[PDB]
């Protein structure tokens, strides 16, 4: 209901702070092949299991987060323990379609 760039930036900085805490303190995975946890600036990713989709909840700082409570963003962890990318130079594949704002 409230629009505030200021409030939204502050929620994003809090989500980033909580994420950094998880990245620092979460125990290492159950060995030793896993895609590595990261904060991509939009979402906080945990370590991935090889050959798996990894889903995290839509970031709670989104102004419309309460409209998408069961939505998830996805990455894919390849069997080699690397995040799926696309081509040569690209960022990791991500699907955030469930977290988008519009009704349609």
């Amino acid at each position: 209901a409230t629009v505030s760039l200021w409030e939204t930036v502050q929620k994003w900085r809090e989500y980033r702070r909580q994420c950094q805490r998880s990245l620092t303190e979460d125990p290492p995975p159950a060995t030793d092949l896993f895609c590595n946890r990261t904060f991509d600036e939009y979402a906080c990713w945990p370590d991935g299991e090889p050959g798996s989709f990894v889903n995290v909840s839509c970031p709670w700082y989104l102004p419309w987060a309460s409209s998408v409570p069961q939505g998830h963003v996805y990455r894919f962890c390849t069997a080699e323990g690397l995040w799926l990318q696309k081509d040569n130079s690209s960022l990791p594949w991500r699907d955030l379609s469930e977290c988008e704002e519009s009704k349609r």
Binding site: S4, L5, T8, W12, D40, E41
Partner: peptide, 25 residues
């Protein structure tokens, strides 16, 4: 009203900025 609607767009732009990689950059 108008300024609230324009702030709303600024906020969408901020979110698009993060999706595009944010401070990374």
């Amino acid at each position: 009203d108008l300024s609230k609607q324009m702030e709303e767009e600024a906020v969408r732009l901020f979110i698009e900025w993060l999706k595009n990689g944010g401070p990374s950059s």
